[PDB]
Design a protein around this ligand. Structure first.
Ligand SMILES: [Mg+2]
Ligand SMILES: [Mg+2]
Ligand SMILES: [Mg+2]
Ligand SMILES: [Mg+2]
Ligand SMILES: [Mg+2]
Ligand SMILES: [Mg+2]
Ligand SMILES: [Mg+2]
Ligand SMILES: [Mg+2]
Ligand SMILES: [Mg+2]
Ligand SMILES: [Mg+2]
Ligand SMILES: [Mg+2]
Ligand SMILES: [Mg+2]
Ligand SMILES: [Mg+2]
Ligand SMILES: [Mg+2]
Ligand SMILES: [Mg+2]
Ligand SMILES: [Mg+2]
Ligand SMILES: [Mg+2]
Ligand SMILES: [Mg+2]
Ligand SMILES: [Mg+2]
Ligand SMILES: [Mg+2]
Ligand SMILES: [Mg+2]
Ligand SMILES: [Mg+2]
Ligand SMILES: [Mg+2]
Ligand SMILES: [Mg+2]
Ligand SMILES: [Mg+2]
Ligand SMILES: [Mg+2]
Ligand SMILES: [Mg+2]
Ligand SMILES: [Mg+2]
Ligand SMILES: [Mg+2]
Ligand SMILES: [Mg+2]
Ligand SMILES: [Mg+2]
Ligand SMILES: [Mg+2]
Ligand SMILES: [Mg+2]
Ligand SMILES: [Mg+2]
Ligand SMILES: [Mg+2]
Ligand SMILES: [Mg+2]
Ligand SMILES: [Mg+2]
Ligand SMILES: [Mg+2]
Ligand SMILES: [Mg+2]
Ligand SMILES: [Mg+2]
Ligand SMILES: [Mg+2]
Ligand SMILES: [Mg+2]
Ligand SMILES: [Mg+2]
Lengths: 209, 122, 16, 56, 114, 120
RNA sequence: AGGACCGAACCGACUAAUGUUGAAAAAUUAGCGGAUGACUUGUGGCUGGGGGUGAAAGGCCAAUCAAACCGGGAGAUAGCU
RNA sequence: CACAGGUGGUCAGGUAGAGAAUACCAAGGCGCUUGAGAGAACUCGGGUGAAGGAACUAGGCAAAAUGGUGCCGUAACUUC
RNA sequence: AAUUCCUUGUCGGGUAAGUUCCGACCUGCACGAAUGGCGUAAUGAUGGCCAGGCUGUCUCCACCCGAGACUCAGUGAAAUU
RNA sequence: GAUGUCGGCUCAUCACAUCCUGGGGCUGAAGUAGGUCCCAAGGGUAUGGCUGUUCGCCAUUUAAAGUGGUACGCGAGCUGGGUUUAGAACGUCGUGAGACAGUUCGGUCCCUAUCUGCCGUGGGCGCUGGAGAACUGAGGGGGGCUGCUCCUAGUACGAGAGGACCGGAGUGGACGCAUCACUGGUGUUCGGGUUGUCAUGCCAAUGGCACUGCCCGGUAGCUAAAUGCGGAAGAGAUAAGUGCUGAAAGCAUCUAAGCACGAAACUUGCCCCGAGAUGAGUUCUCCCUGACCCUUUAAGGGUCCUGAAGGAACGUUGAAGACGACGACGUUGAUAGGCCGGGUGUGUAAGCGCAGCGAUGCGUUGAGCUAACCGGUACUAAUGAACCGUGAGGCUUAACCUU
């Protein structure tokens, strides 16, 4: 099934009458407007392109403005595509609200993880540190050996090394839906989701089920 | 959070005063034992006419920890010291007949029901 | 081994 | 630690392929004095965006 | 911001009495044994208060059966039924962690006569 | 990582930084226009402007507070007797930064920070 | 009273880290030993190379020591590279 | 080498202190002849750490800890 | 045993578990009486072992303050080939 | 005319002669539990005591604590305990200098990475008019572990003792990814207490220095010990194995023709990268519709006019970042600072009054102060411009307009 584009508002909790505190992530899901419908005949695959939010008119380029004008919708902050499931039909200009998740139970949330910059092997790959004392010379958090000897004579591809950590697309699966509030355009899911406050999120019905 | 080499107080009248954890039973590379968990212990100090002697290796269930226990609402109950109740090595079942000090509601599990009944509090 | 018995007590060449 | 063969003059030029400097591209012209200046910086005479800021 | 504030405000209790660190407080908590719901009392000295809206909490320390016990309560949880101040205490500090290493007569707090 | 952290270290220790900005704040109040490096100018705004805000209410307590932060009675007097009154109706923004070029000795980006009123 | 005790100057050099194209051809930092004595230090003097001196390690004799350095026999001799 | 080393003697202020130790100062003398930004890994020199407490390691290496004055009190052993 | 090859001898103690340690035995490969034998209070930057205290030594690393590393301007090496 | 040794630490990678988990045949296999052989390399596969040890023995775990190759993997990655320099001693041998199937105490570990490789991150050009987006997915990588309890069922089986398969549910260990609502750590940019001393003329009140002087708390951020999630199901083709029908060979026979089952291995399903996939793909939208000369006459050169869509640069910056890069904003404006209100933290400021001989207490007063937080607000700074990028886009065949 199709999903919706939302925004990470932050985390809080929901106290139940039983006395259980549920950690929840608040996702603001405003109306998603269909901008284009892909069909097998013209594009070779079935999908819908949606936009959400608003954008300053002075920031919309003429190429982008023309695209929105054909659909007849106001400009949003971006464009996202969702693959259709054959039994699903949508029209250009249609608005989809958070009511889609009324009876979904479990969702998969995709977002961009927080960026950690250049990370070492201890942090990036959970490498063990060498001895802090007992003679160690300038080698407390260094990687150690990176290969064997002459037989290979090289380092193998995929060797875990220091480098950029974070700032990448991540999907968390099978998150329980706690509350769907159409009036407030809100979706509450149990647990933490990737990204910082204010980041764009992609919510879809759970695939594993 | 009790691990190997951790010393514990004894919350029963078995005769032991201080015990040392020598193994955290349960799985490969299991690091810590908390509250309801069972550990292998060695008796380090004991009273003269007790049921157990110094040097004995047997089992025990943790009942109080300084780290504490979390509750479903997010609350936490902490204690000032780590304590355990000695169990028979073969069939568990407390060796002692009296429990000293408060215990927690994480122990009621049919396996440790005798402890609950004998505890002064909770 | 090749280079044993000590060299510079460990630093090799030395002098410097 | 150290090279086994002397690098050529060709490889030297290839490394310096990214060492070229960039010009300023555009110099702004003050509305009042008519003096050229780096954009968002005051002129040599002291003018900025038409106003005689700075007495020097 | 405003969205989360609204969600949190709806769940906040409106009957929390005023208490300060150093005061002796009695907290009634719901204990569910099977289907039987009864109330258990926990009385001690308030040693710490975290004022954080819906996420407010406070720590109470008591000496029970010869053992020091601390319990951190979530203020707005439905598990905590009622809070009652028994005695007012006069202290200068916001956090009273020094009481962990004081016993008997040394741990006594003077009464706040206002 | 420095996520959401404020404050420039400026290759100095904490005690040195505090002392340096205290001197620089006095220089600006006295002369009303000083030339410094652009990074230092941006950081100075968060020190001098709160002092001007404090000066808008004249009381013994506030004068002593200003003294504790500046440690100069001449500066305290000027803040409470002139600058305060001059900026009574202005809601913040008492200083203006004007970029002016590069220092000859080290190619450091320079700027002029001045009080908005000026009128010297 | 004391080859007595604790501890600065002063004289040493037990451990660790740094440094190892060094700040330094033996040091820096933190600790460490002796500290009225078989103590330490200034100035001048005396002992010369199969010789000196050595509370003795083949230690030291001008960053050199199982025989100093400089000049000479001298283009020693190399069945070896 | 405009080198973090070495180099005999004389002088000897204030407050605290047993003190020529140490801390802050006086008289007096200096900021050490590249600077400006940034606030990654990693290296160096430091501060703090939940629960545990030598499980580390050839080895408690390193670190942490103890630390003052007065009074009370102090074992085996001993060449007293 | 600063001496014992076989050898981690055997027995006792200490530890949950002790090739090290302490007390014994004698079967001393290959102790032994001024190239001294066996004791011994005090002393030792001496070798081995145990305990209390203490801790980032470690389970298992987290954060923070400074000097470098990185960028800009000035000056400007080296081994090697 | 040098290839540094044993063990440890860190980090691995492959083989399968498989230790565990998966499938199966025989059993002197009743059940439970075993023996033995075959298939299978997806993942997983202890911590301590002693010793320099590898090893081994011992203690206690685990589903299991596999066997090998990789210069007996790995010192331009670490250590330096053992061997193997110069000091010294014991036993022993020698007349002796000295020596060892030997013991024993002590004893400097150098290198700023050019190339290959590897982990990250940019610039150039190309992709055939230029530009802004969204995609398809050739191909590549990640992941793949498992305990216990309950039900089925005290059933099948068995004289009894004991005690299942198949199927289902719950809850753990280890490992991984994300996150900061909670519980906490840190928090030399916040508040307070306090010792010595110097200064602000002095009192009172403050500031400097002493490791942040020493301490007690603590905001944001970062973070684990904190709390969410994961490993699958399903599908396809199979291995060992089990078959159905069936001749050659009137019978038999799983195979020769034909047909069906069958495992954590394989191809998928799940997650991430990905058109430099030069085989450079697709879809949507936007922009440019001028004149003249010359020669070697052609994908030719030049002149004047024109300068689009868009980009870059500059400025204010960011939960983005080594630098590039990437994201937000530039007055038609909340991008940063300030300011206003709030919150949070600390814990009742100063001044004055009162009580007391005084230290001090009380009142004003939950006061004063309050960083990175929340909601607002043009006060300050984000300047009009300029710069780059053009002017309808080759040839040859088909089809079509107009078969
Ligand atoms: Mg070393
Ligand atoms: Mg070294
Ligand atoms: Mg180090
Ligand atoms: Mg900011
Ligand atoms: Mg600098
Ligand atoms: Mg200071
Ligand atoms: Mg003496
Ligand atoms: Mg020294
Ligand atoms: Mg002494
Ligand atoms: Mg001679
Ligand atoms: Mg000779
Ligand atoms: Mg001759
Ligand atoms: Mg010759
Ligand atoms: Mg100099
Ligand atoms: Mg000098
Ligand atoms: Mg010196
Ligand atoms: Mg001194
Ligand atoms: Mg700790
Ligand atoms: Mg602690
Ligand atoms: Mg050990
Ligand atoms: Mg070990
Ligand atoms: Mg030490
Ligand atoms: Mg120390
Ligand atoms: Mg024995
Ligand atoms: Mg040992
Ligand atoms: Mg002898
Ligand atoms: Mg004789
Ligand atoms: Mg003798
Ligand atoms: Mg050769
Ligand atoms: Mg060679
Ligand atoms: Mg096989
Ligand atoms: Mg597979
Ligand atoms: Mg090897
Ligand atoms: Mg090599
Ligand atoms: Mg060593
Ligand atoms: Mg050695
Ligand atoms: Mg020798
Ligand atoms: Mg000798
Ligand atoms: Mg090395
Ligand atoms: Mg925090
Ligand atoms: Mg005073
Ligand atoms: Mg405020
Ligand atoms: Mg705001």
């Amino acid at each position: 099934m199709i999903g919706l584009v939302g925004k990470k508002v932050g985390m809080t909790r929901i106290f139940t009458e039983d006395g259980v505190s549920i950690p929840v992530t608040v996702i603001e899901v405003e109306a998603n407007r269909v901008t284009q419908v892909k069909d097998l005949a013209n594009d070779g695959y079935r999908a819908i392109q949606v936009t959400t939010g608003a954008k300053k008119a002075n920031r919309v380029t003429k190429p982008e403005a023309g695209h929105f004008a054909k659909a007849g919708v106001e400009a949003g902050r971006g464009l996202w595509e969702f693959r259709l499931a054959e039994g699903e039909e949508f029209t250009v200009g249609q608005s989809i609200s958070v009511e889609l998740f009324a009876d979904v139970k479990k969702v998969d949330v995709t977002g961009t993880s927080k960026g950690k910059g250049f990370a070492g092997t201890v942090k990036r790959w959970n490498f063990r540190t060498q001895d802090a004392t007992h003679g160690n010379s300038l080698s407390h958090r260094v990687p150690g050996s990176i290969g064997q000897n002459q037989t290979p004579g090289k380092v193998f591809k995929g060797k875990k090394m220091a480098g950029q950590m974070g700032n990448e697309r991540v999907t968390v699966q099978s998150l329980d839906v706690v509350r769907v509030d159409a009036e407030r355009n809100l979706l509450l899911v149990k647990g933490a989701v990737p990204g910082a406050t204010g980041s764009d999120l992609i919510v879809k019905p759970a695939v594993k089920a | 959070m009790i691990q190997e080499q951790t010393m514990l107080n004894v919350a029963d009248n078995s005769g032991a005063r201080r015990v040392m954890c020598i193994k955290v039973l349960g799985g490969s590379h299991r690091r810590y034992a908390g509250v309801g968990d069972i550990i292998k212990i060695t008796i380090k100090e004991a009273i003269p006419r007790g049921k157990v002697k110094k040097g004995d290796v047997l089992k025990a269930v943790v009942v109080r920890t300084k780290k504490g226990v979390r509750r479903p609402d997010g609350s936490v109950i902490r204690f000032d010291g780590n304590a355990c109740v000695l169990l028979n090595n073969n069939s568990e079942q407390p060796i002692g007949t009296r429990i000293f000090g408060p215990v927690t509601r994480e122990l009621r599990s049919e396996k440790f029901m005798k402890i609950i009944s004998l505890a002064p509090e909770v | 081994x090749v280079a044993a018995x000590x060299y510079x007590v460990x630093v090799x060449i030395x002098x410097x | 630690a150290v090279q086994q063969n002397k690098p050529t003059r060709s490889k030297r030029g290839m490394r310096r392929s990214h060492d070229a400097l960039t010009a300023v591209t555009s110099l702004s012209v003050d509305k009042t004095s008519g003096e050229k200046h780096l954009r968002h910086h005051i002129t040599a005479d002291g003018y900025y965006r038409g106003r005689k800021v700075i007495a020097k | 911001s405003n969205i989360i504030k609204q969600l949190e405000q709806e769940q906040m209790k409106q009957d929390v009495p005023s208490f300060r660190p150093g005061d002796t407080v009695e907290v009634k908590v719901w204990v569910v044994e099977g289907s039987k719901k009864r109330l258990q009392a926990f009385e001690g000295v308030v040693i710490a208060i975290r004022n954080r809206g819906l996420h407010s909490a406070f720590t109470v320390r008591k000496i029970s059966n010869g053992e020091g016990v601390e319990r951190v309560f979530q203020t707005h949880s439905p598990v905590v039924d009622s809070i009652s101040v028994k005695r007012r205490g006069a202290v200068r500090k916001a956090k009273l962690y020094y009481l962990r290493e004081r016993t008997g007569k040394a741990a006594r707090i003077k009464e706040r006569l206002n | 990582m420095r996520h959401r952290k404020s404050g420039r270290q400026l290759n100095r220790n904490s005690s040195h930084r505090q002392a340096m900005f205290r001197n620089m704040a006095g220089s600006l109040v006295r002369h009303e226009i000083i030339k410094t490096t652009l990074p230092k100018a941006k950081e100075l705004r968060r020190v001098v402007e709160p002092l001007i805000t404090l000066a808008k209410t004249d009381s013994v307590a506030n004068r002593r507070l200003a003294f504790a932060r500046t440690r100069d009675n001449e500066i305290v007097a000027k803040l409470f007797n002139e600058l305060g009154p001059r900026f009574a109706s202005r809601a913040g923004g008492y200083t203006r930064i004007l970029k002016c070029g590069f220092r000859a000795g080290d190619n450091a980006p320079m700027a002029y920070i001045e009080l908005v009123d000026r009128s010297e």
